[PDB]
Design a protein around this nucleic acid. Sequence first.
DNA 1: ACTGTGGCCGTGGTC
DNA 2: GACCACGGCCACA
Length: 754
Amino acid sequence: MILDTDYITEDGKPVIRIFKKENGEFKIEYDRTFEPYFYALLKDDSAIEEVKKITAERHGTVVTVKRVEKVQKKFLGRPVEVWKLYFTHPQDQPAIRDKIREHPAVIDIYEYDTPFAKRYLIDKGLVPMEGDEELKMLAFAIATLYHEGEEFAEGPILMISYADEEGARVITWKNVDLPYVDVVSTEREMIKRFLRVVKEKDPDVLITYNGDNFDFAYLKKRCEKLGINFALGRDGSEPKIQRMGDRFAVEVKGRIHFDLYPVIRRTINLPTYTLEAVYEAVFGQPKEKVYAEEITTAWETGENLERVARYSMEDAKVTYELGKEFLPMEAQLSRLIGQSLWDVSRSSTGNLVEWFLLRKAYERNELAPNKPDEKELARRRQKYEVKEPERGLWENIVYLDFRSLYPSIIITHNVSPDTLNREGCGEYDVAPQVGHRFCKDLPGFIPSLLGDLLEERQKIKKKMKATIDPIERKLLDYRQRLIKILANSVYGHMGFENARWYCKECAESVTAWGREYLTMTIKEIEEKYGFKVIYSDTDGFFATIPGADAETVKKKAMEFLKYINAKLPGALELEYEGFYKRGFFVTKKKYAVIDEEGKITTRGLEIVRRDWSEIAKETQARVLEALLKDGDVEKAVRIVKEVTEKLSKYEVPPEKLVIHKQITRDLKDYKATGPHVAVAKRLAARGVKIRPGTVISYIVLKGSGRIGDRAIPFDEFDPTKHRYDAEYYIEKQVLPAVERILRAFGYRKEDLRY
DNA sequence: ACTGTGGCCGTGGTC
DNA sequence: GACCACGGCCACA
Ligand SMILES: [Mg+2]
Ligand SMILES: [Mg+2]
Ligand SMILES: [Mg+2]
Ligand SMILES: [Mg+2]
């Protein structure tokens, strides 16, 4: 199994290293014969000699074209003759590529900015993370001594914690009597102890959380201060800082630094991304947070240091658990993209798509088109630009959707930049409305690879059902799901402004075909099957037979699938997603349906909005049940009049009136002072410490004037000298919760209260 | 350019 | 009345 590749330099020449793990053994393969290159397209094939003589300067040396060779690659669908230019060293290219491009006889240059070690992976057809190899993993965290006004890492590192399958431990230079704590003399001997542990365990993977920006940079600054060779690399090197945009990232040679933060940040969407919040979201169990000022106070007074020891241990432990949870998916992703786990764990699929396409382009000898320049990226920028669902309560609803609508469209009509308006074909498909014509004589680049992807995904869903190993099944699943994402990302790439295979005509052709096939499918189910489509968005629809039992709907639906799938061209295929006993649809992307087993599902309808109070969420839930499990609209509206009256009589437990709002920043950085902010500023003066991330649990008291002036914290609430604002919780919590739901039923806000 | 972007919204509060 | 800061949805894996 290939972990990664880099290169070093021996006497000015590049030496590819290939870090590998085979049969549980770590190996470094050296390749001293791989040559950097890029392509050039010339006005006349005779001007090659003058191009060979183009020189530049890097450092105190002359940059020369080592050698050239004439090759034939596909470009815009047809074979072309281009000159493959070779050089001595990777770093030669950025110094001479502009001189070759500025040459008059050179029309353009291609594939000139490919990182040398990633180029090696593609040309040699190597795939990271492929094989059986069980990777050894170890996670680690640090706890430091902060003081406001100090430079970064000016204070020492207090504790270092690690965690693996053998447990979680902490190393520190103050005596803490706990069985998972090892005590050393100094911060120096602590960092040295950590280095020994890592060398001893020899992990393939080091897992951090924000290690790219905090942990390694702190360990670095302390190691330079204390003169420690922080030789975490398997080749004796120190961790290496790479800059990815304004972002910083850290690699450890021979291992994989898996920083969880960039992976979590694009897989789940949370208000803030603390380790504790992420562990909560992923595993449901809580994690206590000890703050910088608390850790500093504890270290200085020696009090409650065991609490900081447990927090350090927990940081490591949950980071190892998060690592075991999220690495296999990312490993499958890198195997699919054909790039390193280090790389794919730090980039969005919209950008990983180009690496996948670029590998496909090499596999099929297709000259990759260049990324756009500034003027071109300007012309590609275009401004952002469906019938409202049917009102009422609907019963016996089925949802039918298209299997990979946009990918199937690309494959069925051979949509691709290299097929758009290709002259001299005998068969074209014409896109509705936008009129673009795509050749059908030869398969296109994008459709051909999208076909292999969709076919692969189908094979893997079959092998999934024929696998008893739950580990193997889970990895197959990850692969199948990522394929679906990658195919859609390939469609999206065709519309991306910075995309190499950009093609606006291809993209708007695909949406045009999508609208045509969707409206067609709806017209067929209503006209020839008596269905009524209730709701539709892009690639699926809800529908039922008006006035029909459940079985008649389900059976007649499966018949429509046989009918429409036969009528549909090519890879266009409709499928059956689910049945729903009842459901109502408010507006686009806002609806509620109930599964026969009772499980209710909702689209953006607010149900966990923490912005809201328990009294409002409760009423919303009860209204949904009376609407979907009971079908009584009047029972729902009765519930609303019951709760609004119970609030007005001060008969609702104040505990259900607490509004939990998160403070996002420092109070000094708040321009508009809202109700939770006004409580936070009031608490800060009384002596409390508020900080970015604190939660304010407040209640609104009865009064005129600003809401913030009547808001007190709930632990400050006394039911005998405080009266809550019943009108506020009626008109601005419960009624706004249920108004949009019951406006689709013709009930106006004035019909829901007292 | 996922300690960022894009789209839709709403509300508390100056001025 | 007019406008803004600041949050909540849905995407971006
Ligand atoms: Mg290029
Ligand atoms: Mg720690
Ligand atoms: Mg760092
Ligand atoms: Mg190539």
